[PDB]
Every structure is written in C-alpha cells, then in structure tokens.
Amino acid sequence: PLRRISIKILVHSLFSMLIMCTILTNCIFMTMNNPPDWTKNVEYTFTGIYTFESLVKILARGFCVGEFTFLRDPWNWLDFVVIVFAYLTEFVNLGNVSALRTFRVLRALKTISVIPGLKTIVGALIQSVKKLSDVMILTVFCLSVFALIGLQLFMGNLKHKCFRNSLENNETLESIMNTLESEEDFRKYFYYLEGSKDALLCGFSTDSGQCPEGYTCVKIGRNPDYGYTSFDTFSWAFLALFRLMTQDYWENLYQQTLRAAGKTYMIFFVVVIFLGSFYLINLILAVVAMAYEEQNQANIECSPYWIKFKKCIYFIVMDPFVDLAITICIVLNTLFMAMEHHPMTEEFKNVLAIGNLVFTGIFAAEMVLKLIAMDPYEYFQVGWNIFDSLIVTLSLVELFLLSVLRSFRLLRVFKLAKSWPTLNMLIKIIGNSVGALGNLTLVLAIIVFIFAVVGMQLFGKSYKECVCKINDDCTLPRWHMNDFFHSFLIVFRVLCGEWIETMWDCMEVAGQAMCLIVYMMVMVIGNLVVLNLFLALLLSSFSSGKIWWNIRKTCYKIVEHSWFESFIVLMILLSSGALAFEDIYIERKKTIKIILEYADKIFTYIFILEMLLKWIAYGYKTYFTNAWCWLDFLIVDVSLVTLVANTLGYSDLGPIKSLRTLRALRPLRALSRFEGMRVVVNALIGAIPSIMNVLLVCLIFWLIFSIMGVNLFAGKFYECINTTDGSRFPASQVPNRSECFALMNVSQNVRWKNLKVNFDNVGLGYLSLLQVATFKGWTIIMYAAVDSVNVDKQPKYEYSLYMYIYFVVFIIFGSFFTLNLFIGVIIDNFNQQKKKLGGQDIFMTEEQKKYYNAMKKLGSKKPQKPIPRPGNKIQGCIFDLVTNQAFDISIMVLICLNMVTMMVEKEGQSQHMTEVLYWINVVFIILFTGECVLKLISLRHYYFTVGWNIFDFVVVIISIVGMFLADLIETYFVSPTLFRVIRLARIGRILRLVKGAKGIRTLLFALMMSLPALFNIGLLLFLVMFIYAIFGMSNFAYVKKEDGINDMFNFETFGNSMICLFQITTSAGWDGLLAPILNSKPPDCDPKKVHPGSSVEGDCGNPSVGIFYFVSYIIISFLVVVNMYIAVILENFSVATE
Amino acid sequence: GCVEVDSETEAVYGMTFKILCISCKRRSETNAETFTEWTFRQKGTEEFVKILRYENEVLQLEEDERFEGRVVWNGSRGTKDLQDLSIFITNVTYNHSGDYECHVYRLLFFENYEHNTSVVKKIHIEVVDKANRDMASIVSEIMMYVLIVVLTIWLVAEMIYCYKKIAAATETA
Amino acid sequence: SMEVTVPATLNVLNGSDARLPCTFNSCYTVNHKQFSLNWTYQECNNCSEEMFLQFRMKIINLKLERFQDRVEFSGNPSKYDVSVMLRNVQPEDEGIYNCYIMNPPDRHRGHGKIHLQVLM
C-alpha cells in the first residue's frame, strides 16, 4: 500500500524542487573551508534527507529485488556512493580526513540529475570526448616526439649557471655544492640576477651567454622554477612541451631555453609553436566542432483634461523623429560619460555632472510622457519600455543619494540594439547563452564549482601548513587554493590557459601527484572540452607619325616582360635586406655601411626608372586606378624625397629624419609581386567590412566595460614602490600620498608610481582591457585593482578582493564572448567568400590550388595492387612472412620499444646505463636494417614504389649514418652540438609510428593539405614581421631594458627583433615587451644618454608609437591566426568527409 | 646599449682627432668600477710611455710634452663605470703617430664577490697632411656610377631593340 | 601538536641494547644552526628531568653519571630522525625518556615520550 505513496511522492515537481534546493544549500555549505561547530547536525540533516530520498526511491523501485530497477540507470550510482561515503565518514573513518571529506562533492553533481536537460547535455559532452579520442592520441604522440627532440637538444642545458672563478679556502665546485643549501648561500656563489628565485643561466655558445666577468658557465644545481622547468627527463620534457602546446607561459620557457642553449633554437620554438601548438589547438577545435555540429543537425532534422493631455503628448512625441532625437542624446551621453578620468579639473568634473543630470532629466521626461500617453499597461507590455523604466529609476536613485551607484547608467547603450542589426546579433547570442544553452553555461558553472571545492578540500590545508616553500614572506601567494573564492579564481585562471605558474606552487606545497591530477583534470575538461564547445557553438550559429604609340607599346612590352618583373623582384628583396644591417652595430662595419648607403641611391634610381616606365607603358589612368601601383608610387615618392634631401644637404631636420624611418615600409613592394601574399591580402580586404561592423559593436561593448572600469579604478593604482627592491610599502606606515611624499623627502629611494597600463582614462582602460582579454599582462592590473582602496590611498593587499568578479565578468563577456564572436563572424565571412569564388579556397594561388588538388588525390579509395609474389619459393615464403599482419605489428611493437628506450634516458645517468642504452639502440638499429633489407630482398623491383617504404629506407639509412658518425666523432673530432643534432636522426624510427595509426595519419594528411595556405599566410606574416622588425630596430633600439626587453631579447639587431616579434606573434609577452617602451619622462628614463659607440641619445621610447606598434601587431597577428585557423578547419572538414 | 667600435687609424695634421677605445661589459646590469691608463710609443721607438690616466673622475696627464695641453677626455661622464675610454686630441701633430694602448682596469661588484679584470686596447694611428678618402668609399662610389650607367645602357638597348622590332611589325599592315 | 611518534612503551631485556626510536615530522628542510634536539630522562613520572643529550650545531652528549658512557646518538636528524641508543641497558635505566624538537622556522616544539621498562 505505502509503495503507492512512495511512487506518488517520488514522481513530483515539488519533491524534485526540494531536493534541488537541498543540494544547492549543500553546495553553499561545501564552500566554508572550516565549517563551524553548529554545522555538524545540519550536515546530519543533509545526510538524512539524502538517505530519505534514497529509501523513498528504493521503496518505489526495488521491493526486495536487489535494487535492479534503481541501479540499472547509472545516475543513481552517484546518490548511492554519496550516501555510503556520508555514512562511513559519519561513523569511524581513517586518518585521511580531507581526502575523504572531499568525496561528498558529488552532492554537487546530483544537480545534473535533478535539473532536467543537463542529463542530455552532459551526454553530449561525453559523446564529444569519444570523438576527441583520436585527436588526444595524436596530441600525446606529437607532444612526446617534440619532448624527445627537446630532451636530446637541451638535456641539462637549463642547469647552466654562472659559477664563480675565485674560490676561497681551497674549495671546489663539488665541495661547495654538497655544502650550501640556503638560497643566500647559493647567491654567494652563483649569479642570481637581482630578484629571480633561480640562478641566471649562461651559455658556452657566443650568442646565448652571457656569464658576466668573473663567472664561468657550468651545469650544476637544480633546473629553474623549483626544478620543474627542465628537459632532463622525458617526463619533464613532456610537461614543458604540453606547456608549449597549450601556450601557457611558453614565453618564459622560450627565453630560458634560448639563454641557455643558444639564440639559434628559435628554430626549434618556431617549429614547435607553429606546428604543435597552433595546429593541435585548432585540430581539437576542428574535431569538437565537427562532433558538435553533426549531433546538432542530427538533433534538428479632470477626465476630459486628462484625455486631452494624453492626446497632446502622444501627438507631440512624434514617433518617427523623437526616436532619432533621443538616440543622438544617448550617443552623446555615452561619449560624455567616456570623458571622465582620474586627473581632472573641477571644471571638467562639474561639466560632466551637469551634462549627466541634464541627459537623465531629458530621459525621465520623455519616458514618463510616453508611458502615460500609451497606457502604462501597454507600456510595461514591452521589453524595451520596461528596460527604459528600470534605467530611469536607477538614474533617479541618484537624485540626492560610491561609483557602482552611477556606473549602472552605462547599459543605456544597449538601447541602440533596436536600430543596430549587428548589436541585434550580439543581443541574440548574449541572451541565447542564458536561454537555449543556459544548460551549457550551467554545466560550466557546476564543473568550475566542483573543481574549486575539490582543489580547496585537497590543498588548502597544505597551502597554510607552509607557504614558506612557495613564499619567503611566509604568507599566502596571490593564487592559492585555501579559500573557496581563491580556488574558484584558480579554476578560472586555468580555464584561461595559465595553469603552470600556479601548478608549480601547488606542487611544491602539496605533492606533484595530486597537483598534476587535479590541474590536468581541470585543464582538459575545461579548455579542451567545454570552452571549446562554446566557440564551436558560436561557429555553428554564425554558419547558420604617331611615334608616341609605338613608344608606349615597346615600353609596355619591356615593363611586363617576365625578365624585368623578376629583376624588380630581386631588387625589392635586395633593397629590403639592406635594412637588416642598420642596427646599433653599424658604427662598426663601415665598409658595408658605405656600400649600403650607395646601394640605396642605386635602388632609388632603379625604382624611379621602373615607375616612369610603368607610367609610359600604362597611362596615368591605368596607373592611378590601381592600388598596388598607388602604393609603389607613394613609396617611390618618399624614397625620392629622402634622396633629394640627403643629396641637396641641409637634411637632418626633424620631419625628414622621421620620413627616413618610413624606409621600413620598403618591403611592402613585395605584396604586389608575391601572389601568395597578394591572395591573403585580398581575403583580408574582402573580410574587413564585416570585421569593421563587429569591431564597432565590440568597441562599444568594451567602452561600456571601460567606463565601468574607469569609475571603479580611476587613480587607485598609485603605490609607493621602494625603488631598490620593487616592493610596495607595508601600508601601516605611509598609508597615502601625503605620507609617501614625507617619506620621499626624508629618504631618497621611494617613488610613488603608477602602473602605466591602468584605468586612469578610457584610452588606458581600453589598453588594460586589451591586456586582460589577451591574458598576457592582466595579472598586474588584477593585483592592483584588488589591492585598490581609494584614489590617493596606499593599496592594501586584497583590500577589495572582489574586483576579481569585475574582471571575471569582463573576461566572460568582453573577452570570451566578443573574441568568439569575432571568430564566428570572420569564419562566416570567409565562407561567404569561399562560396562567392566559385567554391574555391581563398588562401591559395591557382598553381598552389592545383598542387593541393593533386596532393589530396592521394586520398585513394582504391587498394593498390599489393605486389606480385616471386616464383622462387624460398623468397616466396620470405614474401608472405614479410607481408603478414603479424610481421607488421611486430615491427610496430619494436618501434614502440625503441621509443621507450629513448624515453628512459635522462640527465646525469651513470656510464653503465649510458652504455647499455647505447647497445640497446645499436641492436634496435641492426634489427631495423635487417627487416628492411630482407623485405628489399623480397621486393627488389617494387619496394621503392611506395612513400612509406622509401621513408623506411631513408630513416634506417640516416640512423645508421648518425651512429657511425658519432663513432667517427669520438675517433676524430669534438663537437657536442653537432653530436646532439646528428643523434636527432634516430627520431625517424619513432616517426615511423604514424604508418599504422590511421586515426592520426588522417590528421597528419590534413595538416599536409593545409600546408600551402599556411605557407602563403607565413609569407605574409614574415613580411609583416620584417616590416615591424625594421620599425623596431629603428625606434625601440636603445630603450631601457625591463621585463620582455633584456640582453637576449630586445630590438637592437635583426635577430633580437625577429625573436621578440615571433614571441609576440602568439601574443605571448607583448605586455612585457611594451612596458619598457611605454615609459618616458624620467625617473622612468634618462632622455639625454650617451650610449657609447653611437650618436643616439636618450634611452626611452615614444609611448604613442609604442602602443600603436604593439597593439597593431597583436591585432594583425590575431587576424592571421584566424586565417590559419580557417585553413585548419577547412582542411580538416575536407579530409574527414573525403 | 654599448658597442665596441674600432678607432680611426688615420689622423690629419693640424686638425683634431678622437681616439676610440670602447670596452663594454658582458652584462650591462653589473655595477662595475673602471678607470683607464694610456701608453704610447712614437713611430720608430722601442718603448711604451704612459701619457694620461683617467681615474674615478679626475684626468691627470703625464709629463709628456708631446701631448701637454693638446688632449682632453672624450669618454663617459660622471658614471664611475666608464665603459667608454675615448681620448680626444686637439691640434694633432706629427708626433701623434704610433701605437697607443688603452688599459681598462675594470673592478666589478657582486654580492660578496669582487672580480678584477683587465682588457687592453691597442690603437695605431698615422698622421697625414691631407685627408685621403678611403679606397672602400671611392670604389663604392665608382661602382655606384658604373652600375647606374650600365643599367641605363641595358634599358635603352632593350628599348630600341624592341622598338624597331615592333616598328617592323607595325608596318607589316 | 608536532608530529612526534615514539613507542609509548619500550620493553628491553637487561643487558641488551635499547634503541629509543622517535619520528619527528615537520615541513621545510632542516637547518644545522636552526635544528635543535633535546633528550631528557626521569626516574619516574613526577621525577625531575635530567638532560642527557642535545643537538646544538652538533651532538652534545652530557655524559651523565647515571648512564656512564652507554648513551649514543642513533639518528640522522635530516631524515626527521633523532633516535638515541642506550647500550647494555641496566635496571636503573627504567623510566621516562623525553625527546624535544624545536625546528626553525617551525614555531611549534615537538615532544615524544617513551616509557622504558627493563625486563629480567
């Protein structure tokens, strides 16, 4: 009988709602980190209602059967595990108190089963990972291959330390190393570049360097970053290269590996980034988007006086014109609030105030007028009417009533969405997020909550037990898992790709095993799964006599002769290369200096002759109706201007000296010639109008965000840094500027300094939002905002601590949503273009297109004639033994074991292990050559007719020659670098693995197909990098060295400028590179320095051109990243379907 | 940053000349401490006579009358980390012809470590009466003009060639 | 309290060697100037404590008359080990042995207490 009451209370809306509210209260209580004493019995009531739900459903389902119908659906295994773990932890349990407390966190995953639909959407997540399988297999394969490369190339190189030369007390390296352990003792013997926890690396090559005077490079001690940044073992190499693939802080590994092993390993980092990192991130995106869209489409398919007043007002509101009137009022109010900054005269202040109150009075008048004109019920009927009502109420709450009070006027700007179709699309997607895929945003919120509380329960005790490992002040770091808020912040900062800097600290405090487990789970499930689903979703949603005439004729013939065109291409290349040599080392090599100064005149003359020939051959009409000819004509005119200036003399005067730096634009004449660059420029030119539309929408989005940020953080970043150490004063003394200045004239070395990228005005706010949205430089702004107190007050450590939610909201919307919106609209535009152009790709020339067609022609559906068996029967049995699948898989397993014996190597291995590994490698080589030579004895005339067979031949040849060359090196010569780079030949034997792994051979063929469009994009990116590097060498050479700019990385020569620019291409470290430029106006500088060896003066850069340079370069690099992203997506689609 | 550039090895009589000796550090952040000493031998002499030593910021000159009153410091100012030891000669004479030697006694500074290095720059200058423009510059200018001439000659050659060819093709109809 | 673990009771035959084993565990790395270990003996629960061995930059054996020269240090402190050895145990050695460990920078002081009983 009561089984009926059980089922009838089980199936019930309010029953499900009460369990929902109970588990949300559970999720509220699981974030206490130290629950009070009165909470044990309420936790008991939680357990009681959970077990009451459980016994209710078992009474409804089982009836002494063995819970068959209750456990046939796995979603109740969750409930059962929850209740049993709760009971065993209530009764006697073991000592792993935190590691068993954390198990009650599935009371948060119970929400997935309680709330409807979430079951289906987590089903979609688990269906997407099943397709992500093969991409993850290929990801770990390439990560391990590049980890072996980096191992063989930099094993121990990160141990290089500049050790002393004058050792006292007859000590030696070992005698002091086994003696010293405190970091001050380490500092007394190594270099330790003024602040870094790790000793500075040096190098034996002439370029890497540079151990100072009295120090000699030697590899002793621990690798940098507590010992976690290293290539010594295959494990640490795989971790550092996963760090590179997810581009997490890869800029520091770049700088360290170059400083230790040589500047010529920029090649290794270029290959690693522009193949592994980019191609793999975008391959994950391609496969996630494919699975998502396939499942998505498979899813889809005085009463008279009052009425006279009413008539009068409803007629005078004059619908078709008062709309535009209040629209321009809204736009002027936007741009009137936008002119508020921290340095403000009281005149500007009261002007802003009166303008704002006038505008809000106008708004209130109009809104109330039309409300009682068209019937408050009919008014409140409409969303925009109720929005304007809300806005006027929040405005009038500032009648006679802190900046969050006023900063809710900002969202007036959305009123423009009714007239703005691009803002309509933006409103559509922003509302869709809380509507149709509110399920996905809720699943993300639940996952982030669960990982926050899991990380807290695991590691927050250790963080407090002793930070003294990861801190010297023995206080909590910035990003610690000790509170729920900070655990959530860490999970957010790992959703953004910045896991490693916090994983190091967490590893040091609480064990590498648990920290790797937790952070790898967070990273994978967030980034490579869910935060990819959002972008794939936006992508899918946006998817859905008369001698003159013969003179002109012969001139046309000569000008369009291929010989003349190639001659001018060669001269363009020469005249552009002639710019690499003019760096700070040009006061030396005076012979080449003079040679280039005369070659520049020769080039000016040649290009003027070409311009005049093109004139005489085309006509002024055909010339000046061509953008390429217009650009060439402009550059030739600038060249002629500077030439006639330097020839007439009297020319080092201001404007013409500035015109001289525009010689950096000489490489632009190569766009017109190289059609690879020309087609990518045409694609970008076709895409630029939609870009401009969405860019205006996102600029006004960011303007809303930046006016909010300015109201929040205007002038609250000034702190008293103590110039020697770079440490903010303790805020117990000197709590404000008036005490900072007393300190500054009682002592000599304190500087009340700003942050130089802040929210002091809307321009700097746009810059700070750019940094926060790029995630490269955001942390200094976040720290200063959360420390902010007031305008002229010394910050206090996390005094606000909740402007972190301002930054979280700004990321989630302005950065996340708008950059994914950029991507969506740009892919939609590129697909519109690909369809307009007859269905052809839009990044390849036509020669490249037919190359790529004949390339994809290898995607044969036909199995080729295997080979004709020989008549000689012993060779025939050899033949079948060779061809059998057992033989194939045996060779595969031998290759895997070769990979394993390459992995097992490490730094500081003993001589016995080294020699036994040598002998295992040589026997591997012998058996590999044996199998290849016997299959050749079988297929003498038919073996080399296959690409994989010729690759096998090539790799066995290169491996045998590398090992015999190591033998000959031993016997004859001495070259460690060449030794290692020749040992690198044996990696082909492992690269043979993709012969049989089809799920990764397919994606390798996809990358090979994408290679031509990638080459055109790389041509254009290299020309943009050349132009920017020449601009760098001209302007930003001689800047002060800080952050990103040092001896190894700066714009002083072409090598240094191109390595800095390749670092920036991935947006990595662009804030650090821009920070030494942004400072002028001493004491940020010395504007009249000497710089021995050159006539240049002053060691800072113009902030205007610095900001322009770096912002424009990161935006152009973003657009070409989108270009390569589209190439990857298109070719993955192609290889999958065909 | 700093850059070591070689001095100019050809003075001219009755004029002024700045002898370059730039010796920068391997790491510019280091807080070194440097002074300098100059030794000089005339042409056809077996000696190396000290002429002028620049210590922390005082430049005191030796008893040599071959340089007395016609030489002044032309290096780093008020730094105490000199890194640029360049000497200026006013009213160059015929006796300013020989091998100079630039001593750089750089005593660095570290945590509890004070290195003591020394680099020696030797500069040989030969005074003349008229400034001879260097053969590299003269051949570069001659080659510039030669290349301009041969390029325009190639241009006009192909011009008239194609022109009379297409004229023969024009009067074919 | 500091993670000090020692056998609460240690039963040893008269004439045998008695290792008094205690484990001290704390975060950080031990410092020689910083790490200090003290051992005391009492004949009974309420009895006055007699220090018999200390670590202060090195082991100091106080050579108490009551032990003759039978006390030895038996532990590598860097390992969190501070055990002592009492050779050729005698009936009068019965009593309470206390290990006190104060380790900078750890503010807390560990304390292990062993009741040594001498068989017959």
Ligand SMILES: C/C(O)=N/c1cccc(/N=c2/ncnc(N3CCC(OCc4ccc(OC(F)(F)F)cc4)CC3)[nH]2)c1C
């Ligand atoms: C928002 C976001 O990250 N969506 C995803 C998510 C996952 C994969 C993915 N595809 C990627 N493929 C290859 N490399 C990358 N990274 C490197 C470049 C990073 O962007 C820096 C940037 C610079 C200037 C910008 O423009 C400006 F200045 F802000 F206006 C905007 C951005 C993003 C990560 N990403 C994308 C694009």
Ligand SMILES: *[C@@H]1O[C@H](CO)[C@@H](O[C@@H]2O[C@H](CO)[C@@H](O)[C@H](O)[C@H]2NC(C)=O)[C@H](O)[C@H]1NC(C)=O
């Ligand atoms: C800024 O920091 C430096 C050290 O980082 C402080 O310099 C110390 O000053 C005290 C008192 O004069 C000396 O006893 C120390 O020897 C100094 N240390 C060093 C490394 O020089 C300086 O005092 C700080 N600024 C202010 C205003 O206190």
Ligand SMILES: *[C@@H]1O[C@H](CO)[C@@H](O[C@@H]2O[C@H](CO)[C@@H](O)[C@H](O)[C@H]2NC(C)=O)[C@H](O)[C@H]1NC(C)=O
């Ligand atoms: C800025 O901070 C200072 C430091 O406490 C405040 O101190 C005032 O002036 C002297 C400091 O020597 C104190 O004896 C006074 O008692 C302080 N004034 C008050 C009203 O308490 C100062 O008030 C702060 N604000 C400023 C200077 O505007």
Ligand SMILES: *[C@@H]1O[C@H](CO)[C@@H](O)[C@H](O)[C@H]1NC(C)=O
């Ligand atoms: C410091 O105080 C002196 C007088 O006490 C004053 O002349 C000087 O201008 C002050 N300096 C600053 C930076 O306020």
Ligand SMILES: *[C@@H]1O[C@H](CO)[C@@H](O)[C@H](O)[C@H]1NC(C)=O
């Ligand atoms: C060298 O000295 C002259 C005057 O003797 C001075 O005008 C010149 O500026 C000095 N050179 C440098 C580089 O300071």
Ligand SMILES: *[C@@H]1O[C@H](CO)[C@@H](O)[C@H](O)[C@H]1NC(C)=O
């Ligand atoms: C150099 O000095 C001589 C006299 O010693 C004098 O006649 C001559 O004019 C001077 N020339 C210059 C350039 O100082």
Ligand SMILES: *[C@@H]1O[C@H](CO)[C@@H](O)[C@H](O)[C@H]1NC(C)=O
């Ligand atoms: C230069 O040297 C010659 C001898 O070599 C000497 O006679 C002459 O006096 C010197 N010049 C000066 C200005 O002392």
Ligand SMILES: *[C@@H]1O[C@H](CO)[C@@H](O)[C@H](O)[C@H]1NC(C)=O
């Ligand atoms: C060593 O330093 C002393 C002064 O401290 C100096 O006189 C001497 O020339 C230096 N020696 C070297 C070789 O640098």
